[PDB]
C-alpha cells in the first residue's frame, strides 16, 4: 500500500518496465552506450511524458498488483510488518 518492508518482494511499477522496456532496446541499437548512460535518460525520459501516456503504463502495474495484495493477506500479522505498542497504567 504505502510503503513495505524488506522481505515481500514489492512487484514491479510502471515505472521500471517502461525502463526495463527501453533498457536494452538501447543498448542493442546503441551499444556504445554505457548500462548506466543507458537508463540515466530512459529515467529522465520518463519523468518529461504526459499522464495518459503514463496511465497506459500504469495498468500494466496495477493488472499485476494483484499479486502484493496476496502476498499482504498473510503479511496481515507480525510477520512481515512490526510495530511498537505501549501499555498505560492500571486501575483498581
Known amino acids: 500500500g504505502s510503503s513495505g518492508s524488506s522481505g515481500i ?12 522496456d527501453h533498457r536494452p532496446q538501447f543498448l542493442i541499437e546503441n ?11 530512459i529515467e529522465e525520459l520518463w ?18 498488483l494483484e499479486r502484493y495484495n496476496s502476498q499482504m493477506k498473510r503479511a496481515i500479522e507480525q510477520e512481515s510488518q512490526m510495530s511498537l ?3 498505560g ?4
Do not use: H, I, N, R
Not at 551499444?31 to 535518460?41: F, G, N, R, V, W
Not at 519523468?47 to 499485476?64: G, I, M, N, Q, W
Not at 497504567?89 to 483498581?92: A, C, H, M, Q
Open 9 to 20: 518482494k514489492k512487484p514491479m511499477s510502471a515505472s521500471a518496465l517502461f525502463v526495463q
Open 31 to 41: 551499444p556504445k552506450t554505457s548500462l548506466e548512460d543507458a537508463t540515466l535518460q
Open 47 to 64: 519523468k518529461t511524458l504526459s499522464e495518459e501516456e503514463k496511465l497506459k503504463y500504469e495498468e500494466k502495474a496495477t493488472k499485476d
Open 85 to 87: 505498542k505501549d501499555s
Open 89 to 92: 497504567p492500571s486501575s483498581g
